[PDB]
Every structure is written in C-alpha cells, then in structure tokens.
Design a protein around this motif. Structure first.
Motif, PDB file in Angstrom:
ATOM      1  N   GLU A  53       0.819  -1.201   0.000  1.00 58.80           N
ATOM      2  CA  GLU A  53       0.000   0.000   0.000  1.00 58.80           C
ATOM      3  C   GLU A  53       0.855   1.254   0.000  1.00 58.80           C
ATOM      4  N   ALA A  54       1.862   1.288   0.873  1.00 57.34           N
ATOM      5  CA  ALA A  54       2.739   2.447   0.949  1.00 57.34           C
ATOM      6  C   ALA A  54       3.530   2.603  -0.335  1.00 57.34           C
ATOM      7  N   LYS A  55       3.919   1.473  -0.930  1.00 54.50           N
ATOM      8  CA  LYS A  55       4.604   1.487  -2.212  1.00 54.50           C
ATOM      9  C   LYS A  55       3.739   2.109  -3.295  1.00 54.50           C
ATOM     10  N   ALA A  56       2.470   1.699  -3.339  1.00 48.27           N
ATOM     11  CA  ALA A  56       1.546   2.221  -4.336  1.00 48.27           C
ATOM     12  C   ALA A  56       1.326   3.713  -4.146  1.00 48.27           C
ATOM     13  N   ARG A  57       1.275   4.155  -2.893  1.00 53.38           N
ATOM     14  CA  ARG A  57       1.082   5.573  -2.639  1.00 53.38           C
ATOM     15  C   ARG A  57       2.305   6.372  -3.042  1.00 53.38           C
ATOM     16  N   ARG A  58       3.496   5.787  -2.875  1.00 53.36           N
ATOM     17  CA  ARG A  58       4.710   6.429  -3.368  1.00 53.36           C
ATOM     18  C   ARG A  58       4.655   6.614  -4.870  1.00 53.36           C
ATOM     19  N   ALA A  59       4.141   5.604  -5.572  1.00 52.43           N
ATOM     20  CA  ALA A  59       3.998   5.716  -7.016  1.00 52.43           C
ATOM     21  C   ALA A  59       3.023   6.821  -7.391  1.00 52.43           C
ATOM     22  N   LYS A  60       1.908   6.912  -6.665  1.00 55.33           N
ATOM     23  CA  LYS A  60       0.871   7.866  -7.037  1.00 55.33           C
ATOM     24  C   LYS A  60       1.306   9.297  -6.763  1.00 55.33           C
ATOM     25  N   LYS A  61       1.962   9.515  -5.622  1.00 52.64           N
ATOM     26  CA  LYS A  61       2.549  10.812  -5.316  1.00 52.64           C
ATOM     27  C   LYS A  61       3.553  11.207  -6.379  1.00 52.64           C
ATOM     28  N   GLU A  62       4.344  10.233  -6.831  1.00 47.85           N
ATOM     29  CA  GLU A  62       5.360  10.488  -7.839  1.00 47.85           C
ATOM     30  C   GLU A  62       4.741  10.938  -9.163  1.00 47.85           C
ATOM     31  N   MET A  63       3.629  10.315  -9.549  1.00 43.37           N
ATOM     32  CA  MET A  63       2.969  10.686 -10.795  1.00 43.37           C
ATOM     33  C   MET A  63       2.343  12.074 -10.716  1.00 43.37           C
ATOM     34  N   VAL A  64       1.733  12.391  -9.570  1.00 41.13           N
ATOM     35  CA  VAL A  64       1.153  13.718  -9.358  1.00 41.13           C
ATOM     36  C   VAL A  64       2.224  14.793  -9.473  1.00 41.13           C
ATOM     37  N   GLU A  65       3.354  14.531  -8.811  1.00 41.47           N
ATOM     38  CA  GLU A  65       4.535  15.372  -8.890  1.00 41.47           C
ATOM     39  C   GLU A  65       5.040  15.514 -10.311  1.00 41.47           C
TER      40      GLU A  65
END
Length: 79
Positions: free
Chosen positions: A1-13
């Motif tokens: 879950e935390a990994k997926a959120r890191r990915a999503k934050k990265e894409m938003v960025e």
DNA sequence: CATCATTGAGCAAATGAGCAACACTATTCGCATAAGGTGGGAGTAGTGAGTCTTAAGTTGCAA
C-alpha cells in the motif's frame, strides 16, 4: 500500500505542469488563482485513481476531463 | 305572600387553527467524458515629514 502511494505521489509530482497549463484558461470567473490550482490538483488525484495503463493512451488526455470537472464544478457551485 | 330583575353559571353550536401520517414529485447532488493540450500577469512609476528600527561601517581602547 505504501509502495503504491509512493507511485501515485510520484505521478502527481510529474503532472503539476499539466494542471497549471490547463489552469490558465478559466481564470477570471470570480475566483482566485490558487483555488483553481488546488481544485485541479484534486481532479488529477482522482484521475490518477481512475487511470489504467494497459489501455494504451497518453495520461494527459484522460486527465483533462477530470481537471475540467474539478474546475467547472468548483466555479459552478461557487458562483 | 308573590314575583321579577338581577346577578352567577355554565353549555351547545360553531369555527379557526392544527396535526400526523402517508404519498407522491420537484429538485438537487454527485458522478463521467480516452489521440493531444505539461511554468502569469498585471504589476505604478507626480509626496513629504517624521519616527522607530536594524544593519553596517567606523573607531577608540585595552589586554
């Protein structure tokens, strides 16, 4: 879950330049600028929530709709 | 001795304002849109006098 959120934050960025670029359009509808950029940030968060990559398109075209949704929604009820 | 006016007393008839409870519909709210669109813009330009505050520059002065 935390990994997926890191990915999503990265894409938003990645896509903040998209959201200001579309944010230039609807400026003077009786609201301030950073309200628009924040609403569009919400919209691209939702677009991240609803995108699939095996579809085979560029992300921005799908994202555009959610951004206009957030903007026109927000200025619409915030008249 | 009788009687009535005259003072209480309360009531039916009528009515005005509700009430709850269901039942139905108008409005509102919330979600969607796929080739691609990846750094704003107006921002004043002709005040002046003063007063407080930093900030820095200089400068005796003593170990």
């Amino acid at each position: 879950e935390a990994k997926a959120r890191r990915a999503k934050k990265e894409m938003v960025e990645a896509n903040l330049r998209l959201v200001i670029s579309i944010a230039k359009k609807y400026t003077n509808r009786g609201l301030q600028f950073l309200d628009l950029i924040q609403e569009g940030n919400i919209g691209l968060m939702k677009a991240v929530d609803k995108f699939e990559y095996r579809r085979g398109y560029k992300f921005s075209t799908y994202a555009t709709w959610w951004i206009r949704q957030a903007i026109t929604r927000s200025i619409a009820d915030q008249a």
